[PDB]
């Protein structure tokens, strides 16, 4: 009776770095920050990108995506009202394929944030995604999409 109403397989989040925020009609999937850090912190004043996918649940739509801004002044370049029983893919997560030579509306709604606050990988930073339906804090992580190991200096025994 591992197959009962509470089963391990069904109640599993995706094995992805981005968090999931189902609150609100539009569901946020694989929401993370591309913020390549060269040191302990990503210093304020540097622009890091905000990846996620906004999937519409209802066909009756919530395609506004008004502000979705928090501490950092997230700006949505190439903003569009995409979600209509479909996906709004703000950016290009590492490994993303354009899927066609051309493109629609230039960039596909790329979200970029001027930090105004140090951030580091491993921490969770709250972002308030607000559609016309409602607002939800998501606690976005920092994800190193596909970058390999940065060479750490060799150690001199002492």
């Amino acid at each position: 009776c591992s197959a009962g109403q509470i089963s391990q397989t069904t109640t599993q989040e995706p094995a992805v770095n981005g968090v999931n925020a189902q609150a609100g009609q539009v569901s946020l999937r694989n929401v993370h920050l591309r913020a390549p850090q060269q040191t302990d912190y990503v210093e304020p004043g540097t622009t890091v990108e905000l990846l996620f996918v906004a999937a519409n649940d209802s066909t009756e739509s919530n395609k506004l995506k008004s502000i979705t801004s928090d501490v950092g002044e997230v700006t949505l370049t190439g903003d569009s009202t995409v979600p209509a029983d479909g996906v709004l893919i703000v950016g290009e997560p590492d490994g993303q394929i354009q899927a066609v030579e051309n493109a629609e509306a230039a960039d596909a709604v790329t979200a970029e944030v001027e930090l105004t606050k140090p951030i580091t990988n491993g921490l969770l930073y709250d972002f308030t995604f607000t559609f016309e339906d409602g607002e939800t804090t998501v606690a976005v992580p920092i994800s190193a999409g596909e970058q390999p190991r940065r060479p750490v200096p060799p150690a001199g025994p002492g």
């Binding site: 302990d40 921490l123 001199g156 002492g158």
Partner: protein
């Protein structure tokens, strides 16, 4: 019985500060030499850089 100390739900906590390791004291006093030089002054050593900007 159960372990005396467990289950502290309250006090959510805080993010650890950036670690600032203290230098090794006389115990592990060994450290890398910063550069040997004559140093006929207060001391500069065998290491000195500079950036000429515009």
């Amino acid at each position: 019985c159960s372990p005396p100390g467990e289950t502290a739900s309250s006090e959510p906590g805080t993010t650890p500060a950036i670690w600032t390791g203290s230098p090794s004291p006389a115990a592990p006093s060994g450290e890398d030499h910063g550069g040997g030089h004559g140093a006929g002054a207060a001391g500069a050593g065998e290491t000195l850089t500079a950036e000429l900007k515009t």
